Amino acid sequence: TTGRIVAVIGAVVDVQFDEGLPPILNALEVQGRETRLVLEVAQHLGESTVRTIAMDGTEGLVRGQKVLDSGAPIRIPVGPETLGRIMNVIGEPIDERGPIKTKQFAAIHAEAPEFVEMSVEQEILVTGIKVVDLLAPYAKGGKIGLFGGAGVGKTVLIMELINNVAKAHGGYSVFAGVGERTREGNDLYHEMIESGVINLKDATSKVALVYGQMNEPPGARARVALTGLTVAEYFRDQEGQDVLLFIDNIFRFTQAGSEVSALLGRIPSAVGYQPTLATDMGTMQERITTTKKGSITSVQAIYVPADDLTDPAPATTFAHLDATTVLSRAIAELGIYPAVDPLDSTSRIMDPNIVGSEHYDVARGVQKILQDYKSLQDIIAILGMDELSEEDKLTVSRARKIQRFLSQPFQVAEVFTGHLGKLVPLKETIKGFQQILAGEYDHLPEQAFYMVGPIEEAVAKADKLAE
Amino acid sequence: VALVYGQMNEPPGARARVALTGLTVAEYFRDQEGQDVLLFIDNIFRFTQAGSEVSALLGRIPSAVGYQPTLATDMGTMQERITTTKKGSITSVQAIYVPADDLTDPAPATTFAHLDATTVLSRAIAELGIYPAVDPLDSTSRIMDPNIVGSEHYDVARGVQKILQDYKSLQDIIAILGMDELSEEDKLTVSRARKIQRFLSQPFQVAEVFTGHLGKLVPLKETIKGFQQILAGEYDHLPEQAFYMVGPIEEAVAKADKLA
Amino acid sequence: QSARMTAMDNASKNASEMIDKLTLTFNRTRQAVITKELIEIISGAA
């Protein structure tokens, strides 16, 4: 069936069909374009007219231009031939390596797995990152979220996780660049070639790449996450092996929806967002999951506009996660990296019956001492340290050492820290904080604990700091 | 002097255009006479406010804080005419009203970049009795430059501002515990800053009914010298009130002598 | 002991006046946030 463009306003294109009107979600092909331009049907406006969202720029479009109904939603290449390749929203190769040598395809719109398909298995996934492992550990096959305002360390952390978890992974990984920097896409692509996780000459590639960065119009940015996760769903269901799915940044899916919302004729909801924010997110998030058929460990970077965690976008995201790592500018500003808020990061498996009583007790002990110090800071800033009881100033000095021992040099952050990266075993993480809490290092200077790996390095640093 | 008036008894169309009427009169004297012109406007905010009133009647979709979407361009098209050219000089002084004391309000906020010198007044300062109620840490000039005013002027100015800023970022602790809790070092900076704050006040010829004092006009060299001496600690022994509502530094000395 | 009694009496008074001043700032901001959000919603709907 054939339609004609009747209106163009930014990324939103209205198309009239004299006969066979395409259903919502269908992919339409604009004729007379040099490069393929897909419109996705969003609404039926009435009068044989559909309202659509463009997957590429709308410059050059003319009222009267012919549009073909493909008879299906956007369909993309899936399967092992996506590994080591880079794809865009509509499935095209963007790596100058010729066609995606596949002939299995999948619609980017799909129903979420049902309640009966859910798995309740939850076992710890050790990261080698002290703050994460101690306080809010990740679970294999679980949903992990990395919250943060602009420039606090979401991407550095996700890259460190890819380094610490994915490089020694027994299955396949999918990375979805959603509304982020193209430079970061180039960085990651060449890094994985250098590491061999992508191989341009044999079939040993472990990672499939999907990108629609902040250079793209909102339709692209609204849909690239669906493309990225469709690739993941194939590896989960048709194989049954374990999959890692990394998304940076999932906020950009919601932001793109908000960019076109007024042009789709919607009254705004709170904070300028689309009224559909939560159901939109729900239909997308509920597909990102482990099932009885296969495991997905998902790690999603989540932007926090204006650093406000109550912003509808991040606020609605929390309920979709099993583990939350919340980054804070207030902490990053102090040179504490990773900038994890130890009093705002949580995990379903932070339970004495899962991690054991030792792990749980030390984690809660660390949180208590830090909350006690936080509550004191403001009082002592005005009335002075000398007004504190011996018990209070002991909790102050230990808390400040604990804050520092949570900081850690990342291998992927060597260009920022000037320190060699470190990976700390969970056993050593527990022991280290246990000893600080127990007052075993009360005699050591504060700075000995800053920017090190295991507790033995803090002792060595204290000796070095003497002379 | 030529006078042009469209006051707060007028409907908004008149209040929105009357500034242009004033400008036009000045433009003639600048261009067709190539002469030094002074232009005084009280109050240019009223131009933008009047624009907001008409915009509401024109049915425009409103911008932030209920303002006209054209606030900045309307202001630009008007302000860019208030200017010196190669053809003639206009020294312009515009009083700028600040809604609810909010300097971030789109009206005053957009006005800043149209100015070469800004004198920002503060209600808090006025309430302390310092007149003129100038905020010494929020008032700026393009000619505050050592290559323009000379290093001596520049150094004393920046020195005054440093001590005032150092006093400012102690306000939190002072408001709770008072000055007596501070270190000797900080007490010294507080005492001098408070004297400088007072020496920045001045009786105006125009405000004699309100101050009760004869108006004073101070030569630039005397202003530089007075604040130079305070910063150097030459008057650390003198009471703060001696520096209040005087002209040159000699009056602060004479005032202290009458007290003790 | 007299001087501490004195200074702390005055500090507690200054704290009281600051609590009032801050509570008033809090509540003006509280109301302004609600009003501003609503005006943005109304403008988008109109």
């Binding site: 002075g384 | 515990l177 007596d180 809790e181 000797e184 | 004195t6 200074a7 702390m8």
Partner: peptide, 23 residues
Amino acid sequence: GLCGAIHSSVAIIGVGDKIRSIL
């Protein structure tokens, strides 16, 4: 501390921990 101008007004022995920390 927290007694106003007690320590500052009076400020090698000195009786009081404020005396030596200030001098």
